[PDB]
C-alpha cells in the first residue's frame, strides 16, 4: 500500500426552489433553480 483515502457518500428526499433574490424590478430578470430538500445541488442530481 502507498496510500488510502475515504470518500463519504451520502444518499438522501424531495425538491425546493432556490434563488439568491426574490425581488425584481419591472423589466429586470432573475434566474431560478431547483435544489433538493436536504441540500442536493444540480451538480449531483442534474445529470
Amino acid at each position: 500500500i502507498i496510500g488510502e483515502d475515504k470518500l463519504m457518500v451520502y444518499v438522501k428526499t424531495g425538491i425546493r426552489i432556490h434563488s439568491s433574490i426574490n425581488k425584481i424590478l419591472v423589466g429586470n430578470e432573475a434566474k431560478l433553480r431547483v435544489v433538493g430538500a436536504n441540500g442536493e445541488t444540480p451538480f449531483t442530481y442534474g445529470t
Binding site: 434563488s19 439568491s20 433574490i21 426574490n22 425581488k23
Partner: protein, 49 residues
C-alpha cells in the same frame, strides 16, 4: 474558535440582503450586533461577509 467581541472593532463587516423593502437593517452600538425591522409582508434572503 470564536473571536472575542472586543476584536470585532478591527473587522470590516459587510451585511448582504436581496429585498431591503420588506426587511430593513441597521448596525447597533455593538459592532457584533445588528437590528432588523419588518416593513411589509414577504420573505428576504440574508448573509454577512
Amino acid at each position: 474558535q470564536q473571536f472575542d467581541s472586543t476584536q470585532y472593532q478591527y473587522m470590516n463587516i459587510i451585511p448582504h440582503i436581496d429585498n431591503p423593502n420588506v426587511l430593513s437593517m441597521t448596525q447597533s452600538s455593538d459592532s457584533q450586533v445588528f437590528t432588523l425591522k419588518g416593513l411589509d409582508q414577504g420573505l428576504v434572503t440574508l448573509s454577512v461577509t
